[PDB]
């Protein structure tokens, strides 16, 4: 069958710069074809026959090649180009997608601010207990997150959760959650939620005494 | 304009069946060179093409499918059906729908998508927690308050504050599988803290897999 690579897998790249991903087929196609998704979203037909922009895309994307191989072309990259894009070919049954290039926005360094919630009496209530740690709106993605509980490092009980990529700012959101039983929560004073980043020279804490306003 | 629509069960047991349908209008089904396709995407993997059928009920299958799909037409109530027998963990995805024609061969309109997982485990609805507004939740001039929803099954859940009214500074997470296997995220919005009394916050929160619909209202906390 008709199958494609692309390359590369992942592109960082700044605001305003040009782009390349490319997508090479296992023998000739008369057409490429090319999509763009963004997450939780369908696919959307961005470039068709090769070279013609689908309605409502921009100037800024243009498709070329001919053969096997296929480039799609951003002129000048902007925040909303955040997405995966795949490749396409309808030339010949099986009808086939390459294996998808993810285009992420390079942007300056921003701290997340630090936010912390303490479980509900709700929660509380109905037996477990749930502490929140949230960084939001920061540059780059990667951040180090730890709890501290009455001054004791916590492992295995936290997980994380991070936002896709802002369309407008490039920034991104992660959520840390501290799960335990009532009966642990209720044992203890200090939580304490860690927060590593590039944009903050030293650590930030955030935390709570259990049991006050 | 046209329009298609994917629906099925959320969840499928091992070795069961699959029926999905998609629903279409803006055009029809008879109308000489329209076909409707089937394609998936397992979480976090590439699109796969599945399967199509024409107007003049031409089939067409993935060779490495072929043994386990059937796509059926019915143009009298614009529906296409796809069948997937013996369904297995590797046939968790979302499921998609797309309109083509013969002076196209690429798909130019596209359902919303179906979430479909198979499993052995039951369906479950959430649990809500509001994550109140207090000085903890307060950074700079910023106050972030938000819904904790817990312990569902399967994917997915939908969330939104006011009613959909309510958009700019909501972070909602994706949701993390825990590990007693049941799912759970936060949704959070941010605004300035001077701001905060400009209006009430309710969180509406949908599992359609378990016909579950509840709406929380997040306050900052007394004492």
């Known amino acids: 069958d008709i199958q494609m690579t692309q390359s590369p897998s992942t592109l960082s790249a700044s605001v305003g710069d040009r782009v390349t991903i490319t997508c090479s087929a296992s023998?000739?196609?008369?057409?490429m074809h090319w999509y763009q998704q963004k997450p939780g979203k369908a696919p959307k037909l961005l470039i068709y026959?090769?070279?013609k922009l689908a309605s409502g895309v921009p100037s800024r994307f243009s498709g070329s090649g001919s053969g096997t191989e296929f480039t799609l072309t951003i002129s000048s990259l902007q925040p909303d180009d955040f997405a995966t894009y795949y490749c396409?070919?309808?030339?010949?049954?099986?009808?086939?997608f390459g294996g998808g290039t993810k285009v992420e926005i390079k942007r300056t360094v921003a701290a997340p601010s630090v936010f912390i919630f303490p479980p509900s009496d709700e929660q509380l209530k109905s037996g477990t207990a749930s502490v929140v740690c949230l960084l939001n709106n920061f540059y780059p993605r990667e951040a180090k997150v730890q709890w501290k509980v009455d001054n004791a490092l916590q492992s295995g009980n936290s997980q994380e959760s991070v936002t896709e990529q802002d369309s407008k700012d490039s920034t991104y959101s992660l959520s840390s959650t501290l799960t335990l039983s009532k009966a642990d929560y209720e044992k203890h004073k200090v939580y304490a939620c860690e927060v590593t980043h590039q944009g903050l020279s030293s650590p930030v804490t955030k935390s709570f005494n259990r049991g006050e306003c | 304009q046209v329009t298609l629509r994917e629906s099925g069960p959320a969840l499928v047991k091992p070795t069961q069946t699959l029926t999905l349908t998609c629903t279409f209008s803006?055009?029809?089904?008879?109308?000489?060179?329209?076909?409707v396709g089937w394609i998936r995407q397992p979480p976090g993997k590439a699109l796969e093409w599945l399967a199509d059928?024409?107007?003049?009920?031409?089939?067409h299958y993935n060779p490495s499918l072929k043994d386990r799909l059937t796509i059926s037409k019915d143009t009298s109530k614009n529906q296409v059906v796809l069948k997937v027998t013996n369904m297995d963990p590797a046939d968790t995805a979302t499921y998609y729908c797309?309109?083509?024609?013969?002076?196209?061969?690429?798909?130019?309109?596209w359902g919303q998508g179906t979430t479909v997982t198979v499993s052995s485990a039951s369906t479950k609805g959430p649990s809500v927690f509001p994550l109140a507004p207090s000085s903890k939740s307060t950074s700079g001039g910023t106050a972030a308050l938000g819904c904790l929803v817990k312990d569902y099954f399967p994917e997915p859940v939908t969330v939104s504050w006011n009613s959909g009214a309510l958009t700019s500074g909501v972070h909602t997470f994706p949701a993390v599988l825990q590990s007693s296997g049941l799912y759970s995220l936060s949704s959070v919005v941010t605004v300035p803290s001077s701001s905060l009394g400009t209006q009430t916050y309710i969180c509406n929160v949908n599992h359609k897999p378990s016909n579950t619909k509840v709406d929380k209202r997040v306050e900052p906390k007394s004492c």
């Open positions: 797309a309109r083509d024609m013969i002076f196209n061969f690429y798909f130019d309109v």
């Open positions: 803006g055009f029809s089904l008879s109308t000489a060179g329209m076909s």
């Open positions: 059928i024409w107007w003049d009920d031409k089939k």
């Open positions: 023998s000739r196609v008369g057409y």
């Open positions: 026959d090769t070279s």
């Open positions: 396409f070919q309808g030339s010949g049954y099986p009808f086939t």
